[PDB]
Structure formats: C-alpha cells, structure tokens
Amino acid sequence: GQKVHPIGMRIGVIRDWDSKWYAEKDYADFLHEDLRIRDYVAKRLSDASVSRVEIERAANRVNITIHTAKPGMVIGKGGSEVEALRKNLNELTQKRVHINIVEIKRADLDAKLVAENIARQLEGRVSFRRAQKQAIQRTMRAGAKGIKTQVSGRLGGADIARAEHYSEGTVPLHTLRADIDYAWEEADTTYGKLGVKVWIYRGE
RNA sequence: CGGUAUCUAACCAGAAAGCCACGGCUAACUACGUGCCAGCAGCCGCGGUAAUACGUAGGUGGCAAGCGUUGUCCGGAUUUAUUGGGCGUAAAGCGCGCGCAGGCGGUCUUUUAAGUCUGAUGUGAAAGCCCCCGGCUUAACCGGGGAGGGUCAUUGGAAACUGGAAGACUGGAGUGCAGAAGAGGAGAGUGGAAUUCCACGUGUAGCGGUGAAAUGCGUAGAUAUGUGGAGGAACACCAGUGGCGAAGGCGACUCUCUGGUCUGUAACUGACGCUGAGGCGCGAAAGCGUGGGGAGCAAACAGGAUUAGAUACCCUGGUAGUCCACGCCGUAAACGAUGAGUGCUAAGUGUUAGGGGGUUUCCGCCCCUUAGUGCUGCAGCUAACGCAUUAAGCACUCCGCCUGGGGAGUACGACCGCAAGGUUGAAACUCAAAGGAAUUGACGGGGGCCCGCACAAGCGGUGGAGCAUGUGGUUUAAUUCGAAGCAACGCGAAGAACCUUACCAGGUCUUGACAUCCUUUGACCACUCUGGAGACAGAGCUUUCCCGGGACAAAGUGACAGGUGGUGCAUGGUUGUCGUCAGCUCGUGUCGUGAGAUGUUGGGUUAAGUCCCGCAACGAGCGCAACCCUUGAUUUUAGUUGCCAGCAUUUAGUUGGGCACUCUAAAGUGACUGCCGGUGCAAGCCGGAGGAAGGUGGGGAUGACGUCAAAUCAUCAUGCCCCUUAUGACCUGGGCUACACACGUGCUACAAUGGAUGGUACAAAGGGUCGCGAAGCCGCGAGGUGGAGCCAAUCCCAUAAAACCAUUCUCAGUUCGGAUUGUAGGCUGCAACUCGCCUACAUGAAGCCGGAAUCGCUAGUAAUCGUGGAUCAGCAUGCCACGGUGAAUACGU
RNA sequence: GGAGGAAAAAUUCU
Ligand SMILES: [Mg+2]
Ligand SMILES: [Mg+2]
Ligand SMILES: [Mg+2]
Ligand SMILES: [Mg+2]
Ligand SMILES: [Mg+2]
Ligand SMILES: [Mg+2]
Ligand SMILES: [Mg+2]
Ligand SMILES: [Mg+2]
Ligand SMILES: [Mg+2]
Ligand SMILES: [Mg+2]
Ligand SMILES: [Mg+2]
Ligand SMILES: [Mg+2]
Ligand SMILES: [Mg+2]
Ligand SMILES: [Mg+2]
Ligand SMILES: [Mg+2]
Ligand SMILES: [Mg+2]
Ligand SMILES: [Mg+2]
Ligand SMILES: [Mg+2]
Ligand SMILES: [Mg+2]
Ligand SMILES: [Mg+2]
Ligand SMILES: [Mg+2]
Ligand SMILES: [Mg+2]
Ligand SMILES: [Mg+2]
Ligand SMILES: [Mg+2]
Ligand SMILES: [Mg+2]
Ligand SMILES: [Mg+2]
Ligand SMILES: [Mg+2]
Ligand SMILES: [Mg+2]
Ligand SMILES: [Mg+2]
Ligand SMILES: [Mg+2]
Ligand SMILES: [Mg+2]
Ligand SMILES: [Mg+2]
Ligand SMILES: [Mg+2]
Ligand SMILES: [Mg+2]
Ligand SMILES: [Mg+2]
Ligand SMILES: [Mg+2]
Ligand SMILES: [Mg+2]
Ligand SMILES: [Mg+2]
Ligand SMILES: [Mg+2]
Ligand SMILES: [Mg+2]
Ligand SMILES: [Mg+2]
Ligand SMILES: [Mg+2]
Ligand SMILES: [Mg+2]
Ligand SMILES: [Mg+2]
Ligand SMILES: [Mg+2]
Ligand SMILES: [Mg+2]
Ligand SMILES: [Mg+2]
Ligand SMILES: [Mg+2]
Ligand SMILES: [Mg+2]
Ligand SMILES: [Mg+2]
Ligand SMILES: [Mg+2]
Ligand SMILES: [Mg+2]
Ligand SMILES: [Mg+2]
Ligand SMILES: [Mg+2]
Ligand SMILES: [Mg+2]
Ligand SMILES: [Mg+2]
Ligand SMILES: [Mg+2]
Ligand SMILES: [Mg+2]
Ligand SMILES: [Mg+2]
Ligand SMILES: [Mg+2]
Ligand SMILES: [Mg+2]
Ligand SMILES: [Mg+2]
Ligand SMILES: [Mg+2]
Ligand SMILES: [Mg+2]
Ligand SMILES: [Mg+2]
Ligand SMILES: [Mg+2]
Ligand SMILES: [Mg+2]
Ligand SMILES: [Mg+2]
Ligand SMILES: [Mg+2]
Ligand SMILES: [Mg+2]
Ligand SMILES: [Mg+2]
Ligand SMILES: [Mg+2]
Ligand SMILES: [Mg+2]
Ligand SMILES: [Mg+2]
Ligand SMILES: [Mg+2]
Ligand SMILES: [Mg+2]
Ligand SMILES: [Mg+2]
Ligand SMILES: [Mg+2]
Ligand SMILES: [Mg+2]
Ligand SMILES: [Mg+2]
Ligand SMILES: [Mg+2]
Ligand SMILES: [Mg+2]
Ligand SMILES: [Mg+2]
Ligand SMILES: [Mg+2]
Ligand SMILES: [Mg+2]
Ligand SMILES: [Mg+2]
Ligand SMILES: [Mg+2]
Ligand SMILES: [Mg+2]
Ligand SMILES: [Mg+2]
Ligand SMILES: [Mg+2]
Ligand SMILES: [Mg+2]
Ligand SMILES: [Mg+2]
Ligand SMILES: [Mg+2]
Ligand SMILES: [Mg+2]
Ligand SMILES: [Mg+2]
Ligand SMILES: [Mg+2]
Ligand SMILES: [Mg+2]
Numbered sequence A: 001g002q003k004v005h006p007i008g009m010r011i012g013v014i015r016d017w018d019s020k021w022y023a024e025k026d027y028a029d030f031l032h033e034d035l036r037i038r039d040y041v042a043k044r045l046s047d048a049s050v051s052r053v054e055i056e057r058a059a060n061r062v063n064i065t066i067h068t069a070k071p072g073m074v075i076g077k078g079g080s081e082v083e084a085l086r087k088n089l090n091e092l093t094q095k096r097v098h099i100n101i102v103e104i105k106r107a108d109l110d111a112k113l114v115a116e117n118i119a120r121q122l123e124g125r126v127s128f129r130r131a132q133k134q135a136i137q138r139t140m141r142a143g144a145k146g147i148k149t150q151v152s153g154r155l156g157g158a159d160i161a162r163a164e165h166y167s168e169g170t171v172p173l174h175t176l177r178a179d180i181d182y183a184w185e186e187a188d189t190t191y192g193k194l195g196v197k198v199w200i201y202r203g204e
Numbered sequence B: 001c002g003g004u005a006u007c008u009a010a011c012c013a014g015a016a017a018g019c020c021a022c023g024g025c026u027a028a029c030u031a032c033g034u035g036c037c038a039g040c041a042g043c044c045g046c047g048g049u050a051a052u053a054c055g056u057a058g059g060u061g062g063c064a065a066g067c068g069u070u071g072u073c074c075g076g077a078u079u080u081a082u083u084g085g086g087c088g089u090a091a092a093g094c095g096c097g098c099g100c101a102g103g104c105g106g107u108c109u110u111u112u113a114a115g116u117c118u119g120a121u122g123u124g125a126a127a128g129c130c131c132c133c134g135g136c137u138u139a140a141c142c143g144g145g146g147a148g149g150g151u152c153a154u155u156g157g158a159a160a161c162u163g164g165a166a167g168a169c170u171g172g173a174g175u176g177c178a179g180a181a182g183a184g185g186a187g188a189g190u191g192g193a194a195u196u197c198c199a200c201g202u203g204u205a206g207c208g209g210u211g212a213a214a215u216g217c218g219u220a221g222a223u224a225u226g227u228g229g230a231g232g233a234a235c236a237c238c239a240g241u242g243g244c245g246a247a248g249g250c251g252a253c254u255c256u257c258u259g260g261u262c263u264g265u266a267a268c269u270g271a272c273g274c275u276g277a278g279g280c281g282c283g284a285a286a287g288c289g290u291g292g293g294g295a296g297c298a299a300a301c302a303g304g305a306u307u308a309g310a311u312a313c314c315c316u317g318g319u320a321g322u323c324c325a326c327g328c329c330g331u332a333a334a335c336g337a338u339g340a341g342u343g344c345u346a347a348g349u350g351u352u353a354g355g356g357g358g359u360u361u362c363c364g365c366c367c368c369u370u371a372g373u374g375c376u377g378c379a380g381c382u383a384a385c386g387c388a389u390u391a392a393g394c395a396c397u398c399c400g401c402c403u404g405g406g407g408a409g410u411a412c413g414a415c416c417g418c419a420a421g422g423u424u425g426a427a428a429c430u431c432a433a434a435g436g437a438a439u440u441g442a443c444g445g446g447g448g449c450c451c452g453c454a455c456a457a458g459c460g461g462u463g464g465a466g467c468a469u470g471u472g473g474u475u476u477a478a479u480u481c482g483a484a485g486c487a488a489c490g491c492g493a494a495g496a497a498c499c500u501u502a503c504c505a506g507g508u509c510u511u512g513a514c515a516u517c518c519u520u521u522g523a524c525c526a527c528u529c530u531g532g533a534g535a536c537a538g539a540g541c542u543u544u545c546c547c548g549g550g551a552c553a554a555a556g557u558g559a560c561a562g563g564u565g566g567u568g569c570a571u572g573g574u575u576g577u578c579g580u581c582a583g584c585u586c587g588u589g590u591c592g593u594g595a596g597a598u599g600u601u602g603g604g605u606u607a608a609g610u611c612c613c614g615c616a617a618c619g620a621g622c623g624c625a626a627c628c629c630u631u632g633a634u635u636u637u638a639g640u641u642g643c644c645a646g647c648a649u650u651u652a653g654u655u656g657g658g659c660a661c662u663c664u665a666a667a668g669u670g671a672c673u674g675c676c677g678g679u680g681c682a683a684g685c686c687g688g689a690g691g692a693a694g695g696u697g698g699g700g701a702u703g704a705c706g707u708c709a710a711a712u713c714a715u716c717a718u719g720c721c722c723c724u725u726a727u728g729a730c731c732u733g734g735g736c737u738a739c740a741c742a743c744g745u746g747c748u749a750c751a752a753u754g755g756a757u758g759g760u761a762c763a764a765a766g767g768g769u770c771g772c773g774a775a776g777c778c779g780c781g782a783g784g785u786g787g788a789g790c791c792a793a794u795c796c797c798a799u800a801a802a803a804c805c806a807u808u809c810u811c812a813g814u815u816c817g818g819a820u821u822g823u824a825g826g827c828u829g830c831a832a833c834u835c836g837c838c839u840a841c842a843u844g845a846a847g848c849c850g851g852a853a854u855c856g857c858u859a860g861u862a863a864u865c866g867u868g869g870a871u872c873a874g875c876a877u878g879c880c881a882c883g884g885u886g887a888a889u890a891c892g893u
Numbered sequence C: 001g002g003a004g005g006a007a008a009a010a011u012u013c014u
C-alpha cells in the first residue's frame, strides 16, 4: 500500500506554502520564474547545507529567504557570496532581488539535512546500517520525539534491491496536528541509485 | 689414546642466525597486485573490484642451531564404558514356549579352612622408573645405598562372609480340601438370515452402473413379485479400552475327549527355586505337493470409461486362491516399537472373577482384602514427548542385542527347503553428515466460528437490434509503443485532419534541430524578388550590444552533443491489489535446559485488538477512534455588487431608504448512550423523553506490518549494453480511422405512464481580458450582422429539462423507431478526399422488451431528467462535478 | 478431552 506525502497532507492545515505570493493573469510565468530561481539557488549553494527557500513578490520586487544551517558559507566574509548570488539572480529574473539569510539552530532536527548527511555517507561507501543508526542517535539526542529512516535500492552493490528502515520513538503519521517533517534524497552510486527517506516527528 | 683433556699469556666486537605462523580453533595486522583466474587448505571454508585466509613488502608472535612437512603409536575417545555407556520414539529386547550344560540362590545351629584376611622363611639377576646421598666447573652422564614389582613355593594363625558335610524351620515352591469364571484346544452332528443357480405362475420395456457415461443383461422376455429345489462360505442382536491363551490367535447351537488360571483353608512335603547359550516344539497371511469342494469375493486377464498418455484409481465379467484332509514352508509395523524373576515406593475414580464385616426382615447400601483390566495424577526419571504400584522410579540374578549413513541384509562359503527362499554374514569404495523431540513462520485439492450488496428478498439492466468506442484477429508500405484473470480492454490519451507522431514512402543534412568551451567578427536575426511540394538554395535593402567584463550573434574546427534504442528480472521515484481488511509490536514481570511462551488464549459485545468479564500478568506504542473538510439547527460581529418588511417611486429591487428577513463568512454553541424504564455481574442490547439532529446523524480526505521478481527504462532520473555520414536531424504525402469475423464498456429505441403542436412554472454548481459576448435587424434552420455591459455577489454564458395545462393521434412495424443514402448549405481552420461537427428537404433499415447466462444498488440510494467544467481553432454517447423528481426489499446464513 | 462403532457426498490440471 502507498502513503501520502506527509508534507502534502499538512499544507494549509498546520503548515504553510513556500511561495507566499498572490497573482492572476501572471501566474504561470511567476511560477516558472520561481522554479528557475529555486533550481539555480540549489545548484549554486550545494555544499552550504541549505534547508529551505521561500519566495515572495510585491510590485516588481522578489524577496528570497534561505533558511540554512551554516550562514557563514552563504553570507560571506562581508557580502561576497550574497552579492554574487543577488547579481546572478538579477540577471536571471530581470527584476530587483533582495536576499535574506537566516540560520537554522538545532540543524539535526531538520529532515532534509539529515537525509543529505546519510546520502553523503552512503556515496562515500559507508555501511547503510551504520549511517542510519548514527543519524537516528544524533536526531534523538537533539531533542526530537520521533525518528524514522529508510534506505532502498541495490544495498551494498547487490544484484537484487531491497529496503531497510529503522526508527526510534513514535511518528504518528495519521494525526493531522502532529508536525512531521519529511525528506527524500538520492545517493549516486556506481552500482545504480539509492533512495533515502527520513521522517522526523518534532514536539508539535 | 696423546702434547689429549687442562692451564698460562697477547689481540679482537670483530670471524658466527635461521625456520614457521598471524580469520576462529591458537599467541600475533597494514598496504600493494590479482580477480571463482592464479591459488591456499587439518576443519569451518576463502578467491566473482575495498581479500586482516591467494603472492609480495613492512610489522608482530613462537622456537632457536635449529625450524617445518610426512609416516607409525598412545591421549583427547566414556568412540567396546571392570574402573566408566546403553536398548518406548535416535543404532540396539530373539515372534513365543519346553528345557540340557552353565550363572545365581529363603532362615538358624554344629563342624571343615577350598575361596577370604594375616605373620614368618626362600625367591622375583644386573641394568631401567622412583627416594636419599655423592663424583665430573653445572647439566646430560656416572657411582653407592634404599624402595617398588607375584591370584609365587614351605609353614603358623582367625572363622564374619561365599563354598563342603550333618541337622533344624516355613515366608519361596508344590500337593491336599471347598468353591468360581471363561470366543482355551481337538472330534462328530445340527440351526436360521442372506447371496447365487435351476423349474414353474403374474406382468411389460427396460434393468444395472457412474462425477457423467459406456461395456453388460433384456421382446428367444428380463428387472420385479410368489412357490419349490440344489449347493457353498460366514455366524446379525448378545458385544462391553469385556473374557481366555506363552505367542500367533479364539465369537451360532449340542455332545465327547482334554490344557491352564483365580479365590477360600493351613491339612501335607520341606528350598524341591530363577534364568537359561546349543537343542526340541508352536507360529497371522501369502506360497508349495496330493485328493476333494467351489455360493460370494477376487491377484493375473479382457472389455468400457477418465487422461496429453493411464500397463492405474472407477464400471462390467473373470482364473488361481480364499474352504476341507494330510505334508512342507518358518516370515510380518509377529508392536505395549517396552526380555524373564523378585521386593520397596502418595492418592482419586470405573470395570471383571472371588472372599470377610457392618447397616438392613430380604433387597440394597457402606467398609476391608486377593487376582486381572482402563483413566487422571505425587515423589522420582527423561533431550523432550512423556512414564509414574500393569514404571520408562529405586535395587539384585540370568539371557539376547547395539557402536556414523550408503554399499547391504548384498557377495563368497556353509546348513535347511520340491521350489519360492530362510538362518549365519562381510569387504573394496563413497559421504560429513544420517537421525530423535520440540519451536516460530509458510503452505494443504484439513476443520470450526465471524464478517462483506457474497448469497437470499427486491428494482433496473447486460446477452437480442442499430450506432459510438477499446481489444483480439486479419489486412497493409505503415496500420507506432505500452496494459493481459480478479488487479488488461471509453485503459496511458483532460481532444490523432496538418502539428501532436514516436510508424511508412519519397526528397534532403552531417560538431549537427538542442548545450558548454575554443579562433576570427561582433547585434544576429527579420523583409523583398527568383526556383521548389516543402526542407532548402540565389540576388538587394540589411542587423541599431551595452558598460577589457558579461549574455546574446555569424562563420571554421574539435572536445563533444543526440537516441520515445534494449533490459521494470540491476534500480530511484510514483501506483494497483487484498482492503479502511484489523492487525503489528515493545517495556517490566513470571513459565520453559533451550530456541521460545504469556500479555495477544476463553465467553460475550462492537463498525473495529471497540469494550467488558474471566485468567500470571501489569501497561504502553504504531494501526481503529479523535484532531482536518463538507452538510443538517442556531448566536454575535458585517451590510455591498446581496435582501425588500413596514414606506414614496419604476417596464421592472428600478430610484430614494433601511439590514427587519433570506444570504454571504469569520468566531462560537450544540450530541455525549448525556437523562428514564427494562435486561445484564459488567460491556452492551430493546424501547422512552427532550431536541434541528440519536446511537461513530450523512458523506469525504486519511490506506499500518506485508503479498504478487504485479505496472511503468515512453513523465522524470539512472548502472550496464548498443548506433554515431545514423537507431541522430529537417520536410511534403500517407497511416494510427483498414474489415470475412469474436469479446469488453456505453448511447438510442422497440411506443398510449406514449408521439406531434400550442401555452406555461421551479435549480444548483461553475467559466469569462490576445475572453464572455446583450439589445436590435436578416435567415425555415445551423447561423450572420451589431457592438452594449463586464478584470465581475454588479455584466455575459443562460433557453434548465423532465413535471403541469389544452387540442390531436387511437394500437397500426404505425403520426413508433431512427440507421442508411441523395441534394443544398453553416462554421473553425493555410487546408475538411482519405478523416471534423452542425443544419434544411427527401429516404425511412433493423427493432414487438431480448436464449443459456450475467451486472449494479440498503435511502435522498437505485431509477430517471437536464446543467457546468478540464483538455480544446473545431471536434465526446467518454471523464469529472451540479442540482429536479424520487422507490422496492432484506424472513435469513 | 480420551477410546469404540459408523453413515451420505466425490471430474482432470496448475
Ligand atoms: Mg493503496
Ligand atoms: Mg507520496
Ligand atoms: Mg511517503
Ligand atoms: Mg521502491
Ligand atoms: Mg700428536
Ligand atoms: Mg689444550
Ligand atoms: Mg699478539
Ligand atoms: Mg688485531
Ligand atoms: Mg679473535
Ligand atoms: Mg677487544
Ligand atoms: Mg661484535
Ligand atoms: Mg650462525
Ligand atoms: Mg597472505
Ligand atoms: Mg617479514
Ligand atoms: Mg621474528
Ligand atoms: Mg579408552
Ligand atoms: Mg552410548
Ligand atoms: Mg532393559
Ligand atoms: Mg529404532
Ligand atoms: Mg516382545
Ligand atoms: Mg524386531
Ligand atoms: Mg522367547
Ligand atoms: Mg545348570
Ligand atoms: Mg547362602
Ligand atoms: Mg633389580
Ligand atoms: Mg644393561
Ligand atoms: Mg654435584
Ligand atoms: Mg640414571
Ligand atoms: Mg644408581
Ligand atoms: Mg643401585
Ligand atoms: Mg620405590
Ligand atoms: Mg559358622
Ligand atoms: Mg504359597
Ligand atoms: Mg424371479
Ligand atoms: Mg515336618
Ligand atoms: Mg536358541
Ligand atoms: Mg494360508
Ligand atoms: Mg492348495
Ligand atoms: Mg474389479
Ligand atoms: Mg524378523
Ligand atoms: Mg519388535
Ligand atoms: Mg523387570
Ligand atoms: Mg488393578
Ligand atoms: Mg498417567
Ligand atoms: Mg528411557
Ligand atoms: Mg533433524
Ligand atoms: Mg511446526
Ligand atoms: Mg498465525
Ligand atoms: Mg485454512
Ligand atoms: Mg466480499
Ligand atoms: Mg448483502
Ligand atoms: Mg453485488
Ligand atoms: Mg439476488
Ligand atoms: Mg429487474
Ligand atoms: Mg443496473
Ligand atoms: Mg445506468
Ligand atoms: Mg456474452
Ligand atoms: Mg453480439
Ligand atoms: Mg447489436
Ligand atoms: Mg449489443
Ligand atoms: Mg442511433
Ligand atoms: Mg462519440
Ligand atoms: Mg490488432
Ligand atoms: Mg504485407
Ligand atoms: Mg509489419
Ligand atoms: Mg495496440
Ligand atoms: Mg514496456
Ligand atoms: Mg478496485
Ligand atoms: Mg478492470
Ligand atoms: Mg471506465
Ligand atoms: Mg485512437
Ligand atoms: Mg508529418
Ligand atoms: Mg548518452
Ligand atoms: Mg540489465
Ligand atoms: Mg520493460
Ligand atoms: Mg524496479
Ligand atoms: Mg516490478
Ligand atoms: Mg515484465
Ligand atoms: Mg517498483
Ligand atoms: Mg521478466
Ligand atoms: Mg490481508
Ligand atoms: Mg494479517
Ligand atoms: Mg497477533
Ligand atoms: Mg495460545
Ligand atoms: Mg487499540
Ligand atoms: Mg482515522
Ligand atoms: Mg446557509
Ligand atoms: Mg429516541
Ligand atoms: Mg463526519
Ligand atoms: Mg515482471
Ligand atoms: Mg497480478
Ligand atoms: Mg502480469
Ligand atoms: Mg510488461
Ligand atoms: Mg534510455
Ligand atoms: Mg528516461
Ligand atoms: Mg509507456
Ligand atoms: Mg518502452
């Protein structure tokens, strides 16, 4: 049986959209400009541990917020990387772009970051069990109420693919006021392609 | 021996270290090379791209002038068990009995010293092991003394025990006396029920058989029924984990001849007993020889069926045999898978054959005891299942047997048999397992309970006809690819004339239609005309980067690009299905040698692992339920584009005016078996009140652990494998729409609850700026023209249709039905032939309610009538939503 | 729960 995307089940219920702008007659072009912005930002700040990007619009003016774990790489020594990004985004959109940076405290409590971590260990040939268990350990000692991870694919370069999952605490997926974060990332292996799924049930 | 041992002086760190191993057993790891190859190996086994096991290098461990390998012996091995094992199910109790030799043997007394125990004498050479002393500079080595070692000969002692002799006694054993029961065995005779065959009356067309049939018997007269006769085998009810026997085994009745057992007495003898190799005898069934008998059944055999085949199971027949007498054979899951004898060790409860006592007039009931036969259970034993006074417990005597699986109960030899074969019984070789009990799952062509529009009760359909659409098949240059029981088939496709397009024909291109960098130029593109089906070529006007940067831009060249090419069985991601089915586990305790178990089993109740009551468990978590959306009632806040009541106005809720009422949308309230009666220990169940609403009120979203190598390399991404002047790229035309046929899903009808004509009411939810498109005018109509109001609670789409009211038709293949075809037109589009949709006039096919069969649905549901939307220039009977009218039935598993 | 007797149904394959 299939499950519904836990984030999709909570958009508008207890969660919020990542694109907080309203438009009519200029909706498709705004949407695809936002998609291009997101892709270009994701391809530039790859190794900066970026957790979330949100975009807003108001009268020929694009505001971008980048929730990231370590702002020192994003916000440079005095504004080198930020201004390079802003100029490139200006040339990409032909608008006026203002870039705002915030820092994620307790970065082990965010699902995308831990999924990136597990994918990075798996790409570096670290046993899947070790990576999953250690990520669970750190996430739980960071103050979570529940963690669940699974890794699926040609595990260890075998001929037949399978999936293995581990958990600690509780993750109630059917409760609507439960605030589960969720992330899926791919690891690029010489044997194929591996998938890492992470559910984090926080206090809310 | 011999200038030998030994000793004295000078020089010298200089002339002197190797082997095996490093994953576990077992002490000691890193890198490189290789890639199921090279190879290692005592075993577990390592080698397929990250090798502490292969080779090497570094390091480490053990030993040392030695270190490894092989061969033989002992240990570990309790794996021949005297010390020191066993035989219910793992290998291991002869099928049973009678018994020679042998082994063992109740109690007491006297006597003997054969066994037993002990003292003395002689001897058990030297060397060797051992103890104490010594000698070589130590040690090895050597010497001295001592000790050890015998079922040893002579001889002296003791007499508890085993043995011998002489006596004595009954508990063992047997006889006597009195009763009891029994399918114990052999011989002869007899009885009834039933089957088969034969003869004769009545009677006519089938009988028999199977999952279905057929072979077969029958009109030459069956099957059926009544009467009589012949012959053979087996003994219904009684009948019972009842009885007898050593075992095999023994069921009708009567008689004759015979074996064994139990209880009662204490009369009699006085250990006369147990076991028992070799011998002798009995021994289910099948089989053999001779002679009878032969009704049923039935190996072999034949025919009919089933099956792909059917040397079988099933059906119709049928010979040996089953029966009797005599003689062989000597086997079995011959089993309680448990050898015989003796004694000891909690209880409860049936039954068979006896004995004693108490109650009681008898009957009967109660207690005690002997010998059998069942069940439940304590200690104890067992790996566990389990056994447990009928031991698999505790002990002793005697016999038989076992030592990893296969080869094999086989070969050679021997004995027995008429034969079939029986008894005794190996080895080479090969494997590292074979096996017993129990546990958690997964299956079964095993079972029980419970639920679901699964069946039942109903309503409407499908299968019949015409058309629309998908699939198979066939055809074709191509008819592009994918989906294949349920879970493929109005499916991907929420729009195939061109494009989409991946397919085919013909015409063209090669760093390229699409990306980064390179080298020169920097704005190239757009436009006109000529040729061409078009892609493309040929001339002119031509290209205006900005501030060396950058993205664009033309030329030439690579590095490269480009694949809807294959593998969904190498994958990520997404989905179907069981199924919104009710499950999946954990913590702490207890029970088990252990893996494990309990909670989670049992009885009720629920939609539900929902809850209650029990119970060695007490709780919790993910799944159920709740939180989210919508609908039904209502309060406050807010009145425009919504509403109009009381007021003036108008073709008009129009204009003025007002939020009263509907309405709109934010926040609350409200339903919880909350209260009442009954029932129940409780959960719960049946009714009642109030309330808009009553039993999770109606409906959504929500899909746990797992199943199907399920679907998708063609949405995307991706390992590996393929093409690269082509499997890439551009164009015009065609095809995906073919048509003897079969299937799936739908639409329209077969008419009077109806057709035609006229009149006339009542919705909801949605869409609209390169868009919706009003009024008016023109047209028979599809439509044209016109341009108002709208970025919308305002304007437009927008006529709702069934329903209702009048007139007509009057049961007719028709004034039903609309396919099919002829002509003339309308729109969109460059273009409507293949191949769009719509209109007018003409034409007027099948079709009379649909066979075997099959589908949906439990209430605002089914049935029926319209409306809107996505895709979309145009195109839906499909899909997704909206309202109008609005049922029947559910006894039950 | 244990022991004894005992009916009726029955196609082939995966
Ligand atoms: Mg599902
Ligand atoms: Mg999802
Ligand atoms: Mg998910
Ligand atoms: Mg997967
Ligand atoms: Mg000399
Ligand atoms: Mg000398
Ligand atoms: Mg000198
Ligand atoms: Mg010198
Ligand atoms: Mg020297
Ligand atoms: Mg020196
Ligand atoms: Mg030296
Ligand atoms: Mg040396
Ligand atoms: Mg090595
Ligand atoms: Mg070395
Ligand atoms: Mg060394
Ligand atoms: Mg030994
Ligand atoms: Mg043994
Ligand atoms: Mg024994
Ligand atoms: Mg055995
Ligand atoms: Mg026996
Ligand atoms: Mg035997
Ligand atoms: Mg015997
Ligand atoms: Mg004897
Ligand atoms: Mg004696
Ligand atoms: Mg000596
Ligand atoms: Mg000597
Ligand atoms: Mg000395
Ligand atoms: Mg010596
Ligand atoms: Mg000596
Ligand atoms: Mg001596
Ligand atoms: Mg000694
Ligand atoms: Mg004496
Ligand atoms: Mg006696
Ligand atoms: Mg007759
Ligand atoms: Mg006497
Ligand atoms: Mg014998
Ligand atoms: Mg016989
Ligand atoms: Mg005979
Ligand atoms: Mg037969
Ligand atoms: Mg035998
Ligand atoms: Mg036996
Ligand atoms: Mg015994
Ligand atoms: Mg008894
Ligand atoms: Mg018992
Ligand atoms: Mg035993
Ligand atoms: Mg086994
Ligand atoms: Mg089992
Ligand atoms: Mg189960
Ligand atoms: Mg079953
Ligand atoms: Mg069902
Ligand atoms: Mg039903
Ligand atoms: Mg149904
Ligand atoms: Mg029915
Ligand atoms: Mg019907
Ligand atoms: Mg129907
Ligand atoms: Mg219908
Ligand atoms: Mg049909
Ligand atoms: Mg048909
Ligand atoms: Mg038809
Ligand atoms: Mg039809
Ligand atoms: Mg039609
Ligand atoms: Mg159609
Ligand atoms: Mg076809
Ligand atoms: Mg052809
Ligand atoms: Mg072809
Ligand atoms: Mg096809
Ligand atoms: Mg495919
Ligand atoms: Mg379904
Ligand atoms: Mg289907
Ligand atoms: Mg359908
Ligand atoms: Mg089609
Ligand atoms: Mg074309
Ligand atoms: Mg490629
Ligand atoms: Mg492959
Ligand atoms: Mg495939
Ligand atoms: Mg896959
Ligand atoms: Mg699959
Ligand atoms: Mg496949
Ligand atoms: Mg898959
Ligand atoms: Mg396959
Ligand atoms: Mg299931
Ligand atoms: Mg299950
Ligand atoms: Mg369970
Ligand atoms: Mg149980
Ligand atoms: Mg629960
Ligand atoms: Mg729920
Ligand atoms: Mg309302
Ligand atoms: Mg009520
Ligand atoms: Mg609800
Ligand atoms: Mg497959
Ligand atoms: Mg399937
Ligand atoms: Mg399939
Ligand atoms: Mg396939
Ligand atoms: Mg590919
Ligand atoms: Mg792809
Ligand atoms: Mg596909
Ligand atoms: Mg494909």
Ligand SMILES: [Mg+2]
Residues within 6 Å of the ligand: B714
């Ligand atoms: Mg596609």
Ligand SMILES: [Mg+2]
Residues within 6 Å of the ligand: B746
């Ligand atoms: Mg339909």
Ligand SMILES: [Mg+2]
Residues within 6 Å of the ligand: none
């Ligand atoms: Mg219809």
Ligand SMILES: [Mg+2]
Residues within 6 Å of the ligand: none
């Ligand atoms: Mg008509």
Ligand SMILES: [Mg+2]
Residues within 6 Å of the ligand: none
């Ligand atoms: Mg009318």
Ligand SMILES: [Mg+2]
Residues within 6 Å of the ligand: B762
């Ligand atoms: Mg109306």
Ligand SMILES: [Mg+2]
Residues within 6 Å of the ligand: none
């Ligand atoms: Mg409306």
Ligand SMILES: [Mg+2]
Residues within 6 Å of the ligand: B767
């Ligand atoms: Mg529209």
Ligand SMILES: [Mg+2]
Residues within 6 Å of the ligand: B797
């Ligand atoms: Mg309309």
Ligand SMILES: [Mg+2]
Residues within 6 Å of the ligand: B798, B800, B867
């Ligand atoms: Mg309308």
Ligand SMILES: [Mg+2]
Residues within 6 Å of the ligand: B813
């Ligand atoms: Mg007609």
Ligand SMILES: [Mg+2]
Residues within 6 Å of the ligand: none
């Ligand atoms: Mg026509």
Ligand SMILES: [Mg+2]
Residues within 6 Å of the ligand: B832
């Ligand atoms: Mg046409």
Ligand SMILES: [Mg+2]
Residues within 6 Å of the ligand: B497, B832, B835, B836
């Ligand atoms: Mg056309």
Ligand SMILES: [Mg+2]
Residues within 6 Å of the ligand: none
């Ligand atoms: Mg006409």
Ligand SMILES: [Mg+2]
Residues within 6 Å of the ligand: B843
């Ligand atoms: Mg005609």
